[PDB]
Design a binder for this molecule. Structure first.
Ligand code: HEC
Ligand code: HEC
Ligand code: NI
Ligand code: NI
Lengths: 106, 106
């Protein structure tokens, strides 16, 4: 999917986790976010100056999703252990990683 | 003032906002952070002592304080509207910006 579809998937499913009642909902949302993050990882940010694939800026972009996926996996482990409240708190910690990447385009 | 002293001003006024009870305290602390951020913006950080003021590194360093000041101005607006709770949440959300500059420059 394109970057915009991925970002909608991420934003939508973070809200799903926030209002979820059970682990199945949290796990399903986190699984969808993980796929969307790995999809977006291969895209190019539209406002980036040097879009050269090996530029530090492009590596910092790709690495942002590595960090995001690691955090998604942290939350997935908690949800996999039936720790719904804890997984939800872990998902909230994603937000600063989202915002970090966005700030490179502001 | 130097970066370390301005950073102390920012860190301490973050705590003043956290324990504040009214809009006057929050406004006073945010205004103090705004001033410290604009003073810090004048400085070349240690890891860039080698770099010109028109260098892209320094443009982005100064831009980071503009982002932070923009967010402080949003929190000020909330406090001037008497939304004391929302202003305090906004001040907390600043910490993500604090950490992002640190990753790239500290
Ligand atoms: C880079 C490493 C990113 C991470 C991590 C996240 N997002 Fe993102 N997002 C990214 C880019 C390059 C952009 C476009 C910026 C621009 O030039 O406009 C976005 C944008 C969004 C949006 C706005 C919708 C859109 O532009 O199509 C949303 C709602 C969004 N992103 C959500 C989001 C969330 C919830 C994230 C973490 C869980 C997240 N993004 C991470 C790049 C990156
Ligand atoms: C760049 C745009 C920055 C923003 C935004 C914020 N800070 Fe910062 N901070 C920055 C640098 C380059 C440094 C290193 C200075 C040095 O001489 O090494 C720092 C350091 C700090 C510190 C440590 C201070 C010390 O005496 O070692 C603190 C406590 C700190 N910064 C706090 C802080 C807060 C709370 C911020 C947002 C509200 C914030 N900083 C923003 C650069 C930047
Ligand atoms: Ni970054
Ligand atoms: Ni000093």
């Amino acid at each position: 999917a394109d970057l915009e579809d991925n970002m909608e998937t991420l934003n939508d499913n973070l809200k799903v986790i926030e209002k979820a009642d059970n682990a199945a909902q949290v796990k399903d949302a986190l699984t969808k976010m993980r796929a969307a993050a790995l999809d977006a990882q291969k895209a190019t940010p539209p406002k980036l100056e040097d879009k050269s694939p090996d530029s530090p800026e492009m590596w910092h972009f790709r690495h942002g999703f590595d960090i995001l996926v690691g955090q998604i996996d942290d939350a997935l482990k908690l949800a996999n252990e039936g720790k719904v409240k804890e997984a939800q708190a872990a998902a909230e910690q994603l937000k600063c990683t989202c915002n970090h990447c966005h700030q490179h385009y502001r």
